[PDB]
Paper text:
In this process the emerging signal sequence is recognized by the signal recognition particle (SRP) and delivered to the membrane to interact with the SRP receptor (SR), where the nascent chain is transferred to the Sec translocon. In bacteria, SRP is a ribonucleoprotein complex consisting of the SRP protein (Ffh) and the 4.5S SRP RNA that forms a hairpin structure. RNCs are then delivered to the membrane through interaction of SRP with SR (FtsY), during which the N and GTPase domains (termed the NG domain) in both Ffh and SR form a GTP-dependent heterodimer. Subsequently, stimulated by the binding of translocon, the NG heterodimer detaches from the tetraloop (closed state) and repositions to the distal region of the SRP RNA, where insertion of an RNA base into the GTPase active site of SRP and SR induces GTP hydrolysis (activated state).
To resolve the SRP–SR NG heterodimer in the activated state, we assembled a quaternary complex between the SRP, SR, SecYEG and the RNC in the presence of GDP:AlFx. Image classification revealed that in the sample used for the cryo-EM experiment, 16% of the particles contain the quaternary complex. In this complex, the NG heterodimer is in the activated state bound to the distal site of the SRP RNA, where we observe the translocon positioned near the polypeptide exit tunnel (‘Methods' and Supplementary Fig. 2). The SRP RNA is visible in its entirety, along with fully interpretable densities for all domains of Ffh and FtsY as well as a density for the SecYEG translocon, which is anchored by the SR near the ribosome exit tunnel. To improve the resolution of the factors bound in the quaternary complex, additional image sorting and refinement were performed yielding a final reconstruction resolved to 4.8 Å resolution. Starting from the tetraloop, it is kinked upward by 30° and untwisted at the distal site by a 40° rotation, adopting a distinct conformation with the distal region of the SRP RNA lifted by 40 Å away from the surface of the ribosome. The density of the NG heterodimer at the distal site was locally resolved to ∼7–8 Å, which allowed us to unambiguously dock without any further adjustments the crystal structure of the GDP:AlF4 trapped NG heterodimer in complex with the distal region of the SRP RNA (helix 5 of domain S). It contacts H100 of the 23S rRNA through a loop that connects the G-domain of the SRP protein to its N-domain, which we refer to as the ‘NG loop'. Notably, the signal sequence in this complex extends 15 Å from the SRP M-domain towards the Sec translocon along the surface of the ribosome in the vicinity of H59 of the rRNA. Due to the conformational change in the SRP RNA, which is kinked upwards on the distal site and acts as a lever, we observe that the M-domain is now raised on one side, in contrast to its position in the RNC–SRP–SR complex in the closed state.
Residue numbers in the entry:
A (entry chain U): 2 to 96
B (entry chain d): 1 to 46
C (entry chain C): 2 to 272
Amino acid sequence: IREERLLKVLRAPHVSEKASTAMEKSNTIVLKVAKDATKAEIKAAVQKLFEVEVEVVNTLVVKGKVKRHGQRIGRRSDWKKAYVTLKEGQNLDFV
Amino acid sequence: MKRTFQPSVLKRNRSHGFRARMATKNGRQVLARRRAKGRARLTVSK
Amino acid sequence: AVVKCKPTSPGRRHVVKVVNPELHKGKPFAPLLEKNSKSGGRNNNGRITTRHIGGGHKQAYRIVDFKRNKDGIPAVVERLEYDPNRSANIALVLYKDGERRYILAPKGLKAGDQIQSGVDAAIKPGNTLPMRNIPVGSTVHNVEMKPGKGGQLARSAGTYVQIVARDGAYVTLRLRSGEMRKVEADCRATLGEVGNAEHMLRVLGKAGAARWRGVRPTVRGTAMNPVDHPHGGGEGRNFGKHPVTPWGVQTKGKKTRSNKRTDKFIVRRRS
RNA sequence: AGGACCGAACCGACUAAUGUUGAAAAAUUAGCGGAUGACUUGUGGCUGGGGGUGAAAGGCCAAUCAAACCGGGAGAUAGCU
RNA sequence: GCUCGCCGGAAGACCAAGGGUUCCUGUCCAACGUUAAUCGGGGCAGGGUGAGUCGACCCCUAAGGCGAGGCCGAAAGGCGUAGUCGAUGGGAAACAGGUUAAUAUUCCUGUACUUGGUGUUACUGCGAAGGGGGGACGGAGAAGGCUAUGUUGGCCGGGCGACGGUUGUCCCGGUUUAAGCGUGUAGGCUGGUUUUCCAGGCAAAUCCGGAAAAUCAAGGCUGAGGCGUGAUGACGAGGCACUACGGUGCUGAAGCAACAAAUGCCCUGCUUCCAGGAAAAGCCUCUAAGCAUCAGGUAACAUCAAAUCGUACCCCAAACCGACACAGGUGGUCAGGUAGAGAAUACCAAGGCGCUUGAGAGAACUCGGGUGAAGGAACUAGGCAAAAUGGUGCCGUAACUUCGGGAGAAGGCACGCUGAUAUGUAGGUGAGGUCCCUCGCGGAUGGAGCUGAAAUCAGUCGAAGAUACCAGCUGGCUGCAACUGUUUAUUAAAAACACAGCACUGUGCAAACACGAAAGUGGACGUAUACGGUGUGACGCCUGCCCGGUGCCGGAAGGUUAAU
C-alpha cells in the first residue's frame, strides 16, 4: 500500500465507556475511520502510524441518528467504527 | 382485514424503481415529466 | 387388465382403470429425459390461446425416436414404460452397438423382441422401412409424410394405417379418420399397430381425475352473459340462435378446412 | 384403497344476536361447512381497459367496474335546475 | 416489596418479511398518551450493532426478463438466436461456557474446522466451453431402530416445620455438559475381481454403454444412534469473605440408573399406487487441441489469506398492513407438567401480563348470562332463538340399495373408589450369572429390577361416578340437484356453475381454432383411442313425429350478376 492513503484513513479516537472497557481489559482501541477504509488498510495504518502491533481489526458501520433542528428534519452522517486488537506487548499512547 | 398494500421491497423496486423506468420509452418520459416538475425524488429508491 | 372398482366412496364408483401389469415400475432411463414446462395454454403474449388447460401433474419429456433412422442394426426390447406425454406406451430398446432409444410400443411387442429398421428388414411388427418395400394392404403406424422427417401419422394408442395403393412414387393410405391420402413411397413406416389399444376404455369417474390430466373446467356458453358469448343469457334457460364458437363462427356442421396446398394429396374426405 | 368417515391447527362463511356518528368503511361472540385434496399457504413471475381473467355472479383487476385509474381534448355539451 | 387474578400450541421464546433507532442510560412534562402522569414506543443530550465458519454478496440454474447479430413491423416498436440476468430451489467450513446498562454462534476462555495462495519434500501424465457418472427430485402407506425429552428411583445438599400428626415407605432443591476427533452398530443398497473385443457416447478416449470368457465368494457403498475422547475442563445447590445493598471475589457436593417416548432422526430409505413425479454448477472420472526433465497432479509439514455489506430493537405486534397506542389482517421455527385419543379441553410450569379514565350508587330500560311452579309450540311467516342430545366398551338395529351402504340407524346396558384373584396379573423392557464365539456395539440361555392395561369376584360412599371443561338431537313423507366441489370480496351459497359420462360437429399436421397489421407463439415438442367447439349432465329405463321456416352440408345443368 501507499502511505499517502494511510494518513487519510484514521479520523479520530472513539471515546466511551465500552471503549475504555475493552482498552483496559482486552487490550483493544476504538477508532472512527473513513467510511471506505477496510480491515487491510486499518491494520496497515495503525501498525504504521502508531508503530505498534495489530492483531486483528473488527469493524462496523454506525448509521447516524435522525434529528430535528427547529422543526427541520436532518440526518446525521454515517460512519465507520473499528475495534482494533493489539498484540499484548503493547501499552497505550494517547497523543 | 387484509388490506390492499402488502409491502415488498424487491417488488417495489422492480415495478417502480429507477432502472425499471429507464428500461422503456414511456418510463424515460415519466422521468422527463418529473424532472420538469422538479420533484425532490423521482422514483422510489431506498 | 381393464378393471372396474368396488364403490367405496361415490367418486370411486364409476372408475374404470386400465392396469397393464407388464409395465416397468421404477424410474425411466435418465439420459433420455428432458425438462418440460406446462404453458397454461398461453402463448408468448401470455394470453390464453387455448382454453381449458392448466394445473395437472408435473411431467418429464421422454425423447422418443420417430425417425427410426439407425439402420440395419438389430435392437432388442428391454422394457415397456409408461409415457405421461402420450396415450400410447413406449419401449426402451437396445441397439447391438450399445445405444438405447425409446420408441413407440407397437402391439405384440414385449420384453425380448428383436426388431430392426432399414430397407432390408424382415416384415414383422415393430420393424420399420420405406414403404415401397411394404406389401400392399399391410397395417402400419408411425408413418412419415416426408422422407427423413420422422413419424407423424398414427401415433396414438390403438391407431394404425392401412396401405391400400401403390402407384409410381405415391402410395395411397387409408387413414385412421377414414380419409384416403397420398404419401410418397419413400417415407418409412412401422409394422403392426400401436399397443395399449384399451386406453380408450378407461373412465375417469370424477372431476378430480380430469383435473390431474391438466384439464380445467369448461363453461357452457349459454350459461354466460350475452357479453361474454354469442350464446348469451336469456331469462332462465334460453337459446334462440344457431350454435357458434365463442368468436361467432358457426359450429355444428361448418367445414373449416381451407388449404389449397395440400389438396392434390387428399383423395377423399372422411365421412 | 378413497375428490371415504369423526375431528383441532388451517381454509371458509350457514344461522342468530350485538354492532349500524362501530372496537372494525364488512367485525365480534355463540353455534356451522370442508379439513389427503377439483385442498391450503409462502416467496418470485405472467396476462392491461374496444383489454385481461372468470367451476360464469356481469363477478374480479388496489376499500372505485354494463368498460379501471391518472394527464390531456376541455371552459366537452346541458332547450335542464 | 407483599398477596390476589389472566395467558400458557401463548397473551411465551427465535427468525424471515416490513419498519428504521422505536434499543440502553441520564434528563425534562408544554404538545403528544382518549384522565393524572414523577411514567412512556413523547421531547433534548449522550451511548449502542465487533464474524474465514450466521445471512447477503459470490458459484449454478427455474419460471420469467433483457437480448449482439438475425426475422418482422408506417415511426415508436414486436418476437427471438448466441448470450446475459433472475431464488422461493442446488453450492466449502464452529461448538460449549463467560461477559455488557444495551452486541455476541461475531467479544473473551477452551476446543476445533474449511477453502484458497506460496513453499518444501516424495511421487507422478497433466490439459475443456467437448464425453460420461453424480448432483437429481411424486403421493400414499407401513413399522422397526433410536434420540430430543420426560417420570420414578439411587445419589448429594439442606429440612423437622406458625395448627392435630411428621427421624420416615417423610419434605424441598440439584443431579448439566456441545461441535469436533476416534470407533463402526440397528438398518438400506449393490455380486465382486481380472482379461479380450465392439464404436454406439457429433472428434478422441484406458471413462460410460455392449458383447465374450476367466475366476471368487466376500466385496464394496451407505448409515441413525451407542461407546470412547472432547473434559484433572467447564457448568453446578450452596457456602465463606466483603458491599455504594445495585453486586464483587473465593470456594464448590453429587453429577448415576431404570422406564416411557415423539410429529424429530435412520429415511432423498423400505412397500405400494398412478396422476409417473425441476434445471444447472460445485463434485468424480475420460480424453481433443495441447505441453512434456517445463507445466501440472497427489500426500505430509511449514507458511500466509479469507475481502465487503447486514448484525441494535419490534415482529400471534402500542414498532408491519389497516388515517388512531384500532377487539381486524401477517409466513416460517421451538413444543414442560397432571388429566386426556389428542397440538381439543381444564388447571399449572419456564416466561409474560392485569388489556392508560377512575370512584360511588345498586331505578326504568338495553346488552351478556344463571334459575323457574303448573303447562309444553298453545309462540311465530317458520320451534327463529333457547333448551335437550353428547363419551368408551358391549348388545342391538328397518324400508330401500348402485350391495359399498343406509348405520353412530333407532334402543339399551356397565362405568367412582378400596381389597382380593396377583403385597402389581396379562403383556412390555431386560440387569446380574452360566455357556458359545468367525471375540464383539456379537449369539443363546437367563430371569433381578422396572413398567403396566383389562377383567372378574367381594366390599363402600353419594341424590347423582362418561359427576367439571369437553362432547351427535332423532324419526317418518316429499320437491330439486347424482355425488366432493365452485359462486355474486361488502344484503343472494341455492334448485345456479362445474362435474364423470353421453352426443353432435370441426380438424391429415405448416391441423382447425386462438393471440398477433406482420414475424412469430399457444394448440403440442401432441397426431383422429388426438385436438378444438356446442349442447346435455352420474347410474337405471329410454330418447317418439315433422325439412314447410331460418341455418348448415352436397350439387352443378340452366336464369341472374362484380371488377375487367
